[model samples]
Target: HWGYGKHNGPEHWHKDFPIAKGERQSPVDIDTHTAKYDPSLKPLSVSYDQATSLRILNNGHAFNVEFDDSQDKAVLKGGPLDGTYRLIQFHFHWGSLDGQGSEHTVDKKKYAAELHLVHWNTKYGDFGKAVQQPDGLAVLGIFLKVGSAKPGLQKVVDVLDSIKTKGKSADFTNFDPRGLLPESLDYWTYPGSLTTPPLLECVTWIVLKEPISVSSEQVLKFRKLNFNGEGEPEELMVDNWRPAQPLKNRQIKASFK
Candidate 1:
């Protein structure tokens, strides 16, 4: 089960699942002052027609979706990126409270939430195997803010009632994952590790600077899930975010073009 709340949260994830200690982690704060601006980084081009057989899973931590590779295509056409990638699993990072749940920080400020679209190289066969390669994966980060008028996010928010209970799973039969992407695809690219255990340094990170908005009511609803077990009263899972880590001499690049 996905553990929530303080002490039992992500920081202690490795204790229960040893593999979590080695997984690549994300949503690190982007320190622009130390990051270099690269004018050549490109936006990812996704073809929805090729993306089919979408399976959404409520993995305790957040909602995640795994898509059929044969049906979908994602291409990072330019700007330091030159190959095509396939969709793997997309999940979200949120705060235990309403005000600060995002994974990646900009100038030391956290947003309401952050969505991660995980992808991998088709040349590596599958996600499980690709993760072992140095350049095996790429993650697109989408920021979520607090507001009621966000056009693209309503679809996800609308389905909250279906998975409102902890450990509850549901099929988002008609939902389109692409609709969750922020309208502006312009992004920052860099080499980073996954935000989870193992923390492997095998990912090419593409984070969108633009954030999408959601209503405060929507955020409050997410906080209703029990951070503990089923028999316990609902505990607000506010502030689920991990603090930023040191860059370890790696360079982060932003695309201005």
Candidate 2:
């Protein structure tokens, strides 16, 4: 369905989705004011299979993929992350209209959207329980920007028609999620929470400084998605983004070296 806009955006989210009142909220505008930092972040070794055989799922809000944990290979180290975490699910958050899709903002600027690659700490028993623990989750956020030329995102756009309607999904048999990752794994890491309802603060967020580009036409296709049921079509869902929140005294580090 369409998002609550104008005087009804984030200011009123908690009213409609009461769980939005949680302490941890995302899309927060990051402030580099704090001096605490880490410089040794590196990409954990991941197998080609674990990165390629991901199963795609359209969970109403966005497109996600459930990784085959049995293949395990994703790793995490340095900073506050001390153990290995399995790649589990990945999804995206976007705007209903153009120029307003990103879930996280920087200095009051919002990108087209944000992609979250969800992972759970192997130290925990399973994804179910790990989700509740503060150290159990790691999400890689990739920013989406709109432009004239498509940045090879067709790998995902090609399947848009299959899940155009809410609650509808297809097998997505021949897709590879690795195609969606930006070229540079160099990212900014911080302690944050989820942007969606319940706003759990248990997430270790790795937001990439470099953004991947998608053509404006591809963005239009994304806007074509319908959130309403089979009949009685609703307004086009555009600008489904949340305004940036305060950082609340958190330190953000990067793997720049």
Name the best candidate (by TM-score). 2
Give the Cα error of residue 149 in candidate 1, in Å: 2.5
What does the lDDT read for residue 39 in candidate 2?
A: 50
Every candidate's CA RMSD: 3.2, 3.1
Give the Cα RMSD of candidate 1. 3.2
For model 1, the stretches where C-alpha displacement exceeds 4 angstroms are 1-4, 13-25, 70-79, 165-167, 227-233
Model 2, span 16-71: residue lDDT tens: 66646555657666554442345555454333343543556555556665656664
Runs of candidate 2 exceeding 4 Å displacement: 1-9, 15-22, 32-37, 40-49, 52-55, 70-80, 148-152
User: Worst 10-residue stretch by lDDT in candidate 1?
Assistant: 71-80
The lDDT per prediction is 0.67, 0.67
Single out the weakest 10-residue window by summed lDDT for candidate 2.
Answer: 44-53
Instruction: Give model 2's clash tally.
Output: 11
Model 1 global lDDT (CA atoms, 0 to 1): 0.67
